[PDB]
RNA sequence: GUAACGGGGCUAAACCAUGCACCGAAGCUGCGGCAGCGACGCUUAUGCGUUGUUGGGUAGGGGAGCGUUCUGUAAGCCUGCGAAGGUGUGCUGUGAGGCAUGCUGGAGGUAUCAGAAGUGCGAAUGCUGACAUAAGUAACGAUAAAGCGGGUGAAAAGCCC
RNA sequence: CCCGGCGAGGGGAGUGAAAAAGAACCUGAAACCGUGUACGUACAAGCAGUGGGAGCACGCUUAGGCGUGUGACUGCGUACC
C-alpha cells in the first residue's frame, strides 16, 4: 500500500514505515504531522481522484528531525574581466517517519 | 624474519639500475646469484654485492637458513647528484650532473 | 627541433616500456665438472663438454 | 614589524590542493594548475544544479511516452487528459508508477480517455 | 527517493524477426532505431542499452519513392588523396543489400561506444532465411 | 573529401490555409533560506510578527569584515601528564576563516579589549635556490693503428716487461 | 663481531631520554623520483572537469539503496592573465 501526497511543493510517493527528507516544516520533533491532500491511493485496487484529493484520504507522520544538508558551495567567474565571488549553502530540511495511511 | 643490506651514494644512475634490479624481484636467493652473474651491466655487480652481504647478515645476525632466503623487497632510491662544468663552444659552458643511488635489498625467509 | 608542451611522466614511462632486460633462461651444467656455464661456453674451471680444455 | 608569509600561504595552498584530489597530471599536484582546475569545476557545478533539473524532467518525459503507447495513447494526448480530468500527479511520480505498478498507471490512462472522450 | 536506472546485469531483451519487403527505406530504418535503444519500453535508461535484437529479412527488396533508386549516392572517401568514390542505390542493392539498409539504421542511432554496441543486435539478411531459429524470434510488423 | 537540409533519411518528415494538443529558459509560479532599502505596529540601545519592494556587472565610488608579525592588559593565563612548526581526520560559519582531535615534534605559546604595521602573490622575457623535460638521446676533441704472451691486482683493450 | 678489495657502504652490539639525534647530524614542507596494495584501462577520438551512474574492493550495520576508494557507459563543456 502507496500513497501520493505533496508537501513542500513537492510530491512523494511513500508506504507505512518509510522516512522521507522534506523542506523544513513549523513542528516539534516529537509532534505528529496529518496530510491531507492526497493524490492517490493504491492497495489492491487504486484510488484515484476525479477531482485533485481523495476524498478520506489522510497520512500520519511522526516528525522525526530537524537539520541542514550538505554544503554546496557557490562559484562565480568572469574571466578576463577581473570579477570572481564566492558563497556556501547548507538547505534545512525535516525527516518524518510515515505512521498510517487511511483511504 | 627480515633482514637488510643497502649501498648508499652508490655510482650509478638509479634508472640504470633499476633495470637489474627488476630481474631479480621476488626469486629465490639461489636463482637470484645466478641470474645477476650473467647479466652483463655494470649495475649487476653491484646490486650482487648488495645482496651477498644481506644474506650474511641475515646468517651471522639472524637465524640462517639460506635455502630459505628470497628477495622479497629490492628497490632504488635516487641520491644527492654531483655538479660538474662541462666546456661547450663559442665560450659557452653546460652543467653535468653524476647522479648516485641508493640500492636496498630485503631478503626474507618467509 | 624541439619540443612545444612538456611531455608527461606517463608517456616517458610507455616509451620505456620495451627497455626490460631478458634474464638467460638456462644455465648448462658440466657432465663432468657440475659446473653452471653459459651454454656453448666454457666453465670457469675450463671444462668444456666433460673435457679438461684450458690449463687455467 | 616585519611579516614572514611561509605559514599562511602554505595552507592556502594545501586547502586548494586538497580540493583537486582525483584529478589529472598537475592538475592535482601543481598548483597553478590547481587552481584553475578547482575554479572551473565550481563554475560547471554551478551550471549544473540546473542542468539536472532539465535532464531529469526530460527522462521523465520519455518513460512516460513510452508507457503510455503501450496503452495505447501517446504523451501529448495523455497529459491533456490528466488535466482535462483534474488529475495533478507530476512527472516524477508518474514515471515511478510507470515503471513499478504497471496496472495504476493502465488505470491512469483509462481516466484519461475517459475525459478526452 | 531516487529516479529509478536499469541495471545493465539484468535487462531483459526479446528477439524479433521483420520482413522488408516493400517497404519504405527511412520509415522503416526509424522504428528499427527506436527499438534497438530502447526507446519502447518504459525502463528507457539514457546510458543503458535496454533495445531488442531484430533481424531484418529481405533486405533487398527495400523500396524508396521519387527517382532515388537511380539518383541517391552514397559517399566514402579511403584516405588517400583523390580517393573520392560514389554508387547509386540501385549499384548499392546489387552488390552488397545489405548495406543499404544498415547504412540507413547506423545514421539514426546515437553516436559513440554505446550506440556501436546497439548496432550489433541488428542483423540484416539479403534474402528469406535466416540461422537463429533457437534463439525463437516473433514476428513483428514494423 | 560527399561539402549550397548539421546528419540520417523524407514524396511528406515539402509548401499554403485553418484548428486543437504537447515540448521548450537561470522568464513566471510553488516551497525553504539570506541580505539591502522604504513605510508600520509595538517597543525605545530594539527586535519580532508584520509590511511593500529590490539584490547581472568592467572602469570607478560607498559600506562592513577575516587573518598575519609586533606593544600594553600579562610576574596573568596555557604548556615535558607535551608549546610552536609539520602531517591526517572530524565538525562548523554567507566568505576571508574558526574549533576539536590522532600521528610527528620537543620548548615555547598566548585569550580578551585596545594600539602600530617591512600585513596577504600566479603572472612583471620578475630575483635566488632546488628539481623536472628533451633522454639514457647527441657526443667522448684530428681516420698515425694496432696484435699477442707473461707480470701484478678484487678486477687489466688502456699500467709494467 | 659479520659481508666487502686490510675499500666505499651496510647489518648487529654498545652509548644515550632519543641514533628514523651518527657527524651528508634540531625541526624536515613542496616540486621531483620510487616500492607495495585496491579499483580502472589494449574498437576507442578533443581544456580531461562537471551532472547522472552500474560493477568491484574494504569497513560498518543484522542489511537497510550507509561510509571510504575506484569509475565502465552517458548529457553538457575550446585553460588562465
Ligand atoms: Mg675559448
Ligand atoms: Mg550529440
Ligand atoms: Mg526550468
Ligand atoms: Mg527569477
Ligand atoms: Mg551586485
Ligand atoms: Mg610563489
Ligand atoms: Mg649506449
Ligand atoms: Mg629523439
Ligand atoms: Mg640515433
Ligand atoms: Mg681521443
Ligand atoms: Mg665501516
Ligand atoms: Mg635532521
Ligand atoms: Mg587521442
Known amino acids: 500500500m502507496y500513497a501520493v501526497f505533496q508537501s513542500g511543493g513537492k510530491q512523494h510517493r511513500v508506504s507505512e514505515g518509510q522516512t522521507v527528507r522534506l523542506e523544513k516544516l513549523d513542528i516539534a520533533t516529537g509532534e505528529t504531522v496529518e496530510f491531507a491532500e492526497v493524490l492517490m491511493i493504491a492497495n489492491g485496487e487504486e484510488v484515484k481522484i476525479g477531482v485533485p484529493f481523495v476524498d478520506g484520504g489522510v497520512i500520519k507522520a511522526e516528525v522525526v528531525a530537524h537539520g541542514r544538508g550538505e554544503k554546496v558551495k557557490i562559484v562565480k567567474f568572469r574571466r578576463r574581466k577581473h570579477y570572481r565571488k564566492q558563497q556556501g549553502h547548507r538547505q534545512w530540511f525535516t525527516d518524518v517517519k510515515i505512521t498510517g495511511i487511511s483511504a | 624474519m627480515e633482514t637488510i643490506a643497502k649501498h648508499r651514494h652508490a655510482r650509478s644512475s638509479a634508472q640504470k639500475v633499476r633495470l637489474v634490479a627488476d630481474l631479480i624481484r621476488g626469486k629465490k636467493v639461489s636463482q637470484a646469484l645466478d641470474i645477476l652473474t650473467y647479466t652483463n651491466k655494470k649495475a649487476a655487480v653491484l646490486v650482487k654485492k648488495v645482496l651477498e652481504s644481506a644474506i650474511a647478515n641475515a646468517e651471522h645476525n639472524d637465524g640462517a637458513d639460506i635455502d630459505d632466503l628470497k628477495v622479497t623487497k629490492i628497490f632504488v632510491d635516487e641520491g644527492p647528484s654531483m655538479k660538474r662544468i662541462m666546456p661547450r663552444a663559442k665560450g659557452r659552458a653546460d652543467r653535468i650532473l653524476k647522479r648516485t643511488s641508493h640500492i636496498t635489498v630485503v631478503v626474507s625467509d618467509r | ?56 | 614589524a616585519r611579516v614572514k608569509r611561509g605559514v599562511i600561504a602554505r595552507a592556502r595552498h594545501k586547502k586548494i590542493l586538497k580540493q583537486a584530489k582525483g584529478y589529472y597530471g598537475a592538475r592535482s599536484r601543481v598548483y597553478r594548475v590547481a587552481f584553475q582546475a578547482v575554479i572551473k569545476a565550481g563554475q560547471y557545478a554551478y551550471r549544473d544544479r540546473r542542468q539536472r533539473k532539465r535532464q531529469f524532467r526530460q527522462l521523465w518525459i520519455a518513460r512516460i511516452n513510452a508507457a503510455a503507447r503501450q496503452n495505447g495513447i501517446s504523451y501529448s494526448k495523455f497529459i491533456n487528459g490528466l488535466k482535462k480530468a483534474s488529475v495533478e500527479i507530476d512527472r516524477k511520480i508518474l514515471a515511478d508508477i510507470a515503471v513499478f505498478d504497471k496496472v495504476a498507471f493502465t488505470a491512469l490512462v483509462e481516466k484519461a480517455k475517459a475525459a478526452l472522450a | 527517493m531516487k529516479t529509478f536506472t536499469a541495471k545493465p546485469e539484468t535487462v531483459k531483451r526479446d528477439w524479433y524477426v521483420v520482413d522488408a519487403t516493400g517497404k519504405t527505406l527511412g520509415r522503416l530504418a526509424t522504428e528499427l532505431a527506436r527499438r534497438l535503444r530502447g526507446k519502447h519500453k518504459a525502463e528507457y535508461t539514457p546510458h543503458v542499452d535496454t533495445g531488442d535484437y531484430i533481424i531484418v529479412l529481405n533486405a533487398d527488396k527495400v523500396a524508396v519513392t521519387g527517382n532515388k533508386r537511380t539518383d541517391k549516392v552514397y559517399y566514402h572517401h579511403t584516405g588517400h588523396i583523390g580517393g573520392i568514390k560514389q554508387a547509386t542505390f540501385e549499384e548499392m542493392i546489387a552488390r552488397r543489400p545489405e548495406r543499404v539498409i544498415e547504412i540507413a539504421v547506423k545514421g539514426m542511432l546515437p553516436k559513440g561506444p554505446l550506440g556501436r554496441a546497439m548496432f550489433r543486435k541488428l542483423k540484416v539478411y539479403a534474402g528469406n532465411e535466416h540461422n537463429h531459429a533457437a534463439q525463437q524470434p516473433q514476428v513483428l510488423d514494423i
Open chain 3, 1 to 56: 627541433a624541439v619540443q612545444q608542451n612538456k611531455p608527461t611522466r606517463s608517456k616517458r614511462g610507455m616509451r620505456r616500456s620495451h627497455d626490460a632486460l631478458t634474464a638467460v633462461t638456462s644455465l648448462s651444467v658440466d657432465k663432468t665438472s657440475g659446473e653452471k656455464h653459459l651454454r656453448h661456453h666454457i666453465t670457469a674451471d675450463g671444462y668444456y663438454r666433460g673435457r679438461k680444455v684450458i690449463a687455467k
